[PDB]
Amino acid sequence: AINSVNALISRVFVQPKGDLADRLNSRVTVVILAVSSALLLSSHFDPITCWTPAQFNAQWVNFVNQYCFVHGTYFVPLDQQLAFEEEERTKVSIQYYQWVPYVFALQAFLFYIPRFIWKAMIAYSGYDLAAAVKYVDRFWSENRDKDDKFKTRLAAFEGRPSVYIWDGIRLARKKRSRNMALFYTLSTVWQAVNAWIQFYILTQLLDSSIYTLWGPSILGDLLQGNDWQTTGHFPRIVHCDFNRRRPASVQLDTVLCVLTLNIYYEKLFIFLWFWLVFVAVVSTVNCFKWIYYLCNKTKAQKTIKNYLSTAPIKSTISDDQFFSALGEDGLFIMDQMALNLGDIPASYLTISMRNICQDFI
Amino acid sequence: AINSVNALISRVFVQPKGDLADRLNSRVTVVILAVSSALLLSSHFDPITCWTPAQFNAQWVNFVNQYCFVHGTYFVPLDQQLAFEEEERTKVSIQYYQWVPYVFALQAFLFYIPRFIWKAMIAYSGYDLAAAVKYVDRFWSENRDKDDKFKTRLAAFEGRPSVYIWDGIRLARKKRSRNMALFYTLSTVWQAVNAWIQFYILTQLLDSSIYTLWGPSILGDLLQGNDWQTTGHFPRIVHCDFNRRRPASVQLDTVLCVLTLNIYYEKLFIFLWFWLVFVAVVSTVNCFKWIYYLCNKTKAQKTIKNYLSTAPIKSTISDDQFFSALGEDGLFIMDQMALNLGDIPASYLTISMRNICQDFI
Amino acid sequence: AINSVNALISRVFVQPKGDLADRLNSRVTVVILAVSSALLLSSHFDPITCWTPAQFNAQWVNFVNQYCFVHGTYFVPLDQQLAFEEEERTKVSIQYYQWVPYVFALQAFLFYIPRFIWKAMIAYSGYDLAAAVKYVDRFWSENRDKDDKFKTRLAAFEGRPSVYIWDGIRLARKKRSRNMALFYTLSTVWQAVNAWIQFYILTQLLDSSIYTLWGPSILGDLLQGNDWQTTGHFPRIVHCDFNRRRPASVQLDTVLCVLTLNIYYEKLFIFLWFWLVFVAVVSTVNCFKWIYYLCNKTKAQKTIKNYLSTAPIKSTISDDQFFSALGEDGLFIMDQMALNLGDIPASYLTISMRNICQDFI
Amino acid sequence: AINSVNALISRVFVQPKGDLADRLNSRVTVVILAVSSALLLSSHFDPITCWTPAQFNAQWVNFVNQYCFVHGTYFVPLDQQLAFEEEERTKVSIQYYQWVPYVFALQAFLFYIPRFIWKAMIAYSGYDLAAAVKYVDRFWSENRDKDDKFKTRLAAFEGRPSVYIWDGIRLARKKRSRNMALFYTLSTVWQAVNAWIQFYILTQLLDSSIYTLWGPSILGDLLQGNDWQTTGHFPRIVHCDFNRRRPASVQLDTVLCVLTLNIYYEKLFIFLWFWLVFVAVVSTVNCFKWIYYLCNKTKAQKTIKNYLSTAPIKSTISDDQFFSALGEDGLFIMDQMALNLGDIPASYLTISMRNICQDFI
Amino acid sequence: AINSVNALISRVFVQPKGDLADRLNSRVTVVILAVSSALLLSSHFDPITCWTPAQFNAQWVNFVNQYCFVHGTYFVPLDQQLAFEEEERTKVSIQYYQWVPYVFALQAFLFYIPRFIWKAMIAYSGYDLAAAVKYVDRFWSENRDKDDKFKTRLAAFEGRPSVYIWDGIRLARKKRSRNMALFYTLSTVWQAVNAWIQFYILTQLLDSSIYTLWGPSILGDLLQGNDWQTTGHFPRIVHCDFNRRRPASVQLDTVLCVLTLNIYYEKLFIFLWFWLVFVAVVSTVNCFKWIYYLCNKTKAQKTIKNYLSTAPIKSTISDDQFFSALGEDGLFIMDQMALNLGDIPASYLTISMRNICQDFI
């Protein structure tokens, strides 16, 4: 059959509204890992097929099938005979079927957490950016078109939106926010550390006792033409111990089982390793951006002092004390308005807020 | 069954808005290679069928089927007997089933990257073309029809849109853009090099040790009537080594397996080679266009100096110093407006911007 | 099952807007050949059934089925025995299964190319007919109904649309178009040559070594009652060589296989030959029309000089010098407006353009 | 399963707009023959079942099934033994499975051609009736309701629609139409001859060597209770020659096969013969109508001279010379307006055109 | 499975607009007989099952199944032995499977013809009732609600609708209609005779040689408890002659086949006989209504002379000569307006037409 779900993918992939730069790799990460996880445990609707001997009546084949899938499997390159005891034969032991498809779902969830941390944390800060942005937005969606306001366009932002934002600041500033920028940079630290932990989980996945995977080694093998049977690891043909019961208890034998899933798993561990290390390095530089921002803060004002330089007629109020009134809170939320509404609609907003800021400072 | 997906193909094939010339062969390339890849690994919902001997009970047939698919296969033209050892029989060894259907998906993704590079890079440059184009666009969609503005049509562009664009330039020009044209031509260099690398991946695909494919050789064979068995390569009937286990370990035999997929794969490697070399040569000339543009730049102004020659009443301001004010940034974004909105609506825009450009120069 | 796709057929069959006369046989050709191709390789969801002898266990039947389909088949009229060697038996050898269903898809694509050549070429010429036609169109869709403009109807075309068209000509005429008519007639030459090449591909299809098909011979046989077995070619019952492997290598035998597809293929090669030769002869006369047009050009003006003869009040400007101003470019685009908008709405447009043409000549 | 397609049947059955009287039996003919054809080759999703002897293993049953379907079948009434040689047994030979379901599709197409001839031919004539009719139509759809125009209703047709039609005549009359009526009557001759040829194809279908079908003979048999086995023709139980291969080559035997399709085919050849002869005789009288029209032409004016007799106030212009101005072209297009818009809305149009016709004559 | 088609049943069952009294039993008749016919030949997706003896291998069971269905079957009450020869055993011979399900479809079509006769015939008469009724209808749908016209309501019908109808009469009366009432009563004669012929076809169906069916006999048996086996006719268990072929030719035997369809067929021949005789007697009285109408015609005017008796203020014009002007044509179309629009909206129309009728008489 075929399964194509457009809508549910569009829910996370689209619906929640933000343009946040490359923080939307949480949005797409959840989709990739969620779809891969839900696809693998779907078993491509036979995971494993086996050689079980002549006289089994085919209700046992459908048994030794699972009993090989559930109980572990192992591998030996072939011609070593079987070795002996339980050890040298079981030395290389490949069962990651138990982990991978579920631990991916867990991965995806742990990529979704940081957004939740940011929503709950901004609701803790007291000043909601979602409402403000969606407001000044549609203010800019209405009268951008209307020709009645252009020569007035500057004075239009003065009354209606700028009093809304500048009014929200008065309420928030009395409740648990001068700090909301700090809360944001903690959110992005959590983003980075989360990414690296996920990557490390990919590495330590499979089993650390038998190697570990990271891409340029595997591609540095395949592209040398080492396949599997001559590379000594990661096989597609696995022997399977097997146990009946009689008054002689164990009665174990070895039945080799061709193994399909191992053709997918290491075709997508070459991709998904590159893509997770990419999400890691693009998420970790975004963090140092904001520690730099939070630290220097004298060059955090370059964008605002830049917008105030266009400033038709440049009326009166001085520069510094405007930052004295706006400094802790608004200096951030402006860096948010520029990121969503665009650039030019923000400059009008921050040049209007300079005119009406008196009573507060 | 039948699978027909119109919508998801229309998402990439349509939804993101641009007319960029023959840069939309990334758009269609992703569709061709993505659909081919997703179709091949669908196995036309039997990949390979085999001759396995008389006494197997049909749970082994369904085994030696995979065990032949997963483990490699090879070919010998027939009547050579089997030769001997492991080598002369395995000399020509055909397994590209492992690579092709997945490496196509990887291809498609690597065709989608350059668009991403251009979006992220223009967001780095500071001046967003998407917003501007979509703005002056619907400005031209509203009052193109309205009869109240025609004798005023020139003066209409003066106030409303031209102040928007010409205002965006003031903001961008202070932040990391005189260069956005250079960023664009780097994007197109990446486009070309990406295309040629993809083509080279097609060539080196299959296995370089046993020939390599490029079209006029294969068609230069088929159209001479060499099929396969007499051309010595690329078969549809492949022998398959096979291994049981007993106290005598290997016990290998040879069971020839009729092989269906090889009827598709080299029907679409004749097409897809031509089509990739075409995308290559149409993408590589588009690049030299922009290096020429970026270099000479005295003949990059021919279109603007051309629009200013229609110029009703040709009021006052001289020619050169207009380019002195507009030169680095706007000279590009105009070449973008002409490409999307059409030609005649752009000439009005660039003849209006000449009138209101004073304060900035 | 049943597959009925209305929408995707309506996309090519309808969506792209033009009335171009019998150039829409590219539009319908792509549909016929695409649907036939996609239907044939669907195998009418058994291509071939065979007689394979008594003791095969039905996993071999499902093998010799393909091994007969993939490896070639041949035919002998029956009672000749088998002849001998490999030659006299294989003299008539029927395998076109490999070619036909795919080479049809290739056909269809090569019918779609010329439209692409025309779009890209008109975008090279500098003056876009699509925008202009869709503009003066909906200008004629709005105020055709409105009763306020009829006595003014002539003066209505004067201001709004005619300045748009006549303004586009000023821009184009400075960039790489006096020639757009020539580009068009090259497009139609490509149309004709493309058609004849496709037809010749039908002929040389099957195999030229064993006859070739063209309709009045086949119908000139069937309607004489020659079927197949007595006509010596084109059978529905084909013998199939077959090869096992043992220490005696070849072990070939002959197993006759009833062959279904051959009932479809030559029911639609009687139709599709007629229909391609029709598309050829209707496409090739359309070409000589435009070479005649491009050559004489004194009788290319008959339609315009005809429209200017209705001409209420026939004000002032002389005849010839109007053509001197309009000659190279507009004389074409008018022959385009007449073809899409209809006839009477074009006459108003070309009688209005005579009034406002002064400044340009 | 069940297949019900409403929309595609509604496309031809409805969408193209015309009321043309009983020329819409092309419209419905295409539907009947197309649906019958597509239903028969669907095989009622077993065409033929057979008696094949005891020891065949059921992969041969599924062979001799086709090999009987593809290779011909014959019939003998039973108890004649088998006769002998190849002739007396094969005398009556029933295979129309090869022809019927496809030749119906061909029929349907050849019913659709004449409409195409009429569209292309009217586009050759220079004056498009589709646009005009759809125009004066919605002119009559708008202000039929509006109460502001009734006492003015006559004067309403004077300005807006009548100048449109009467203006189109000026353009057409200069290009290849005084004749469009003649083109129409050639179209209807083609209609009639096409119908009779189709009917004759039904007759000569099956095989002329063994009888031929026309209804009152078959019903004149069935309703006498002659079924098949006693009527000597048209059986439901057919013997089937069959050929193996051994060192004795032919080895033919006779295996009688119950035959289902023959229960449908002559249930719908009783219907479809009546219905085609009806379409023939209703289409052939429609033709003599228009040859009469084109010939006498003094009584072709009875409808117009009839409309001019209601004529409130009957102002001035004489009768004959109005026909002198309108005679060749408009006299037809009026007989078209009466057929689509109805009758009363046409009389207003032709009584208005008498008032404004001066300048043209 | 399940098949439920609402829309196609709603097309005939609803879409064509008329209230014609009990002439809509053609509308519902077509649905009943069409659905029954299409359901029966669907075989309730096994028509007949049979006892065929022990040693048949189940590819013969699936043969003797059809060979019993196609070739006839017969019946004997049981214990008579088999009798002898071919006659006494085959005396009662039940095969109506061949006829019934198709002859029902033919029935339905022959119920649909009379509507077609009426549409074509009214289009022959020259005055189209469909347009008029649908016009004065929506005239009554608009201003019935509007409160501005009530005291004016009488004068409202005077200008707008009544001039439309009374104007159509002037055109029609000059072309082939004083007679349209006569055409209508011929249509209803055809309706009645058609109904009785259909009923007689039900009777003579099955086979007249073995009884015939009409309801009160069958129910007069079942409700006496005569079932089948003791009533001597109409069985559910039928013996089936059967023929192999050997050098002894016939080799016929008798294999009794349980027969399911016979449980449906005479459950719905009890219903459908009553329902057809009802449609007959309700359709035949509707006919004598109109012969009475057409004949006396002095009491055909009772409804109009009745409406003119309400007549506010009863202005001037006498009674009889109004009928002299309206007599042949309008006297009918009024009896049509009363049947569709209702009664009270018609009285206003016929009291308005009395006021404005002067010029015509």
Residue numbers in the entry:
A (entry chain A), B (entry chain H), C (entry chain G), D (entry chain F), E (entry chain E): 7 to 51, 54 to 369
Can you provide the manuscript's text about this entry?
Invertebrates possess a different gap junction protein family, termed innexins, that is essential for eating and developmental functions in Caenorhabditis elegans and for electrical synapses in Drosophila7.
The Met1 to Gly6 residues at the N-terminal end, Ile52 and Gly53 following TM1, and Glu370 to the C-terminal end were not assigned due to the disorder of the structure. These densities could be assigned to lipids carried over during purification, which may serve to stabilize the transmembrane bundles and may also contribute to the conformation of the N-terminal funnel due to the proximity. The N-terminal loops are harnessed by the cytoplasmic dome, and the disordered Ile52 and Gly53 cause the flexibility of TM1 in the pore cavity.
